[PDB]
C-alpha cells in the first residue's frame, strides 16, 4: 500500500513543526519515509484602491497570501497511518490523505 | 398576467445577475477567486480572511 499525505497550510512555521513531527514519528516507527518535497509556493495578489470614493492620489494596496504545500510518502497499511495522522493537528494546518 | 409579467425578464447573464454578498451593491465587484463583493467590504474585512498588505 503506497500512501501519500499532503500538508497544506497558510502559516509556515506551524507547517514546519507538524512536518518535522510527522517525519520524526515515521522515523521512530521504523518506516521507510521519503523526504519532504517542497512545492513552489503560490502568491495571492489582488490590488485595489485605498479610498472608498473616487478622489485622491491614485494609491493602491498589495494584499498577499502565501500557501505552502508539502508531500510525504510512506509504504504502510491503512489503520496505522490513520492512527499516526489523527494526532495533534493544528487549526491552521490542513492535512489530507490520498492512496495510490 | 401579473404573475407571468412580473419578473419574466431574464437575469441569466449580465452585471445584475451577481451582487455583493456583504452589502448587496452592484458597483466595483471583485469576482476573482470567488470573493464576490465590492472593494470597500474586502478592504474592511480583509484581516480576518488572512490577506496581509506585506508588499
Amino acid at each position: 500500500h503506497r500512501i501519500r499525505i499532503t500538508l497544506t497550510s497558510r502559516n509556515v512555521k506551524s507547517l514546519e513543526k507538524v512536518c518535522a513531527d510527522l517525519i520524526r514519528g515515521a522515523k521512530e516507527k521504523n518506516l521507510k519515509v521519503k523526504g519532504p518535497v517542497r512545492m513552489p509556493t503560490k502568491t495571492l495578489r489582488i490590488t485595489t484602491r485605498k479610498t472608498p470614493c473616487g478622489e485622491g492620489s491614485k494609491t493602491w494596496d498589495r494584499f498577499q497570501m502565501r500557501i505552502h504545500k508539502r508531500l510525504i510518502d510512506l509504504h504502510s497499511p491503512s489503520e496505522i497511518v490513520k492512527q499516526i495522522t489523527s494526532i495533534s493537528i493544528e487549526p491552521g494546518v490542513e492535512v489530507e490523505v490520498t492512496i495510490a | 398576467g401579473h404573475q407571468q409579467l412580473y419578473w419574466s425578464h431574464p437575469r441569466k447573464f449580465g452585471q445584475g445577475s451577481r451582487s455583493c454578498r456583504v452589502c448587496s451593491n452592484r458597483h466595483g465587484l471583485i469576482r476573482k477567486y470567488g470573493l464576490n463583493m465590492c472593494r470597500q467590504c474586502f478592504r474592511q474585512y480583509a484581516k480576518d480572511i488572512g490577506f496581509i498588505k506585506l508588499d
Binding site: T8, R10, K42, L44, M65, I67, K69, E94 | Y33, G34, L35, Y45, D48, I49, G50
Partner: peptide
C-alpha cells in the same frame, strides 16, 4: 461529491467563514 474547488478557494472560503 462533485464540486471539488481548487486549493485557493478552500482557504478563501474558510477565511470568509471565519469573518
Amino acid at each position: 461529491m462533485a464540486v471539488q474547488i481548487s486549493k485557493k478557494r478552500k482557504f478563501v472560503a474558510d477565511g470568509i467563514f471565519k469573518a
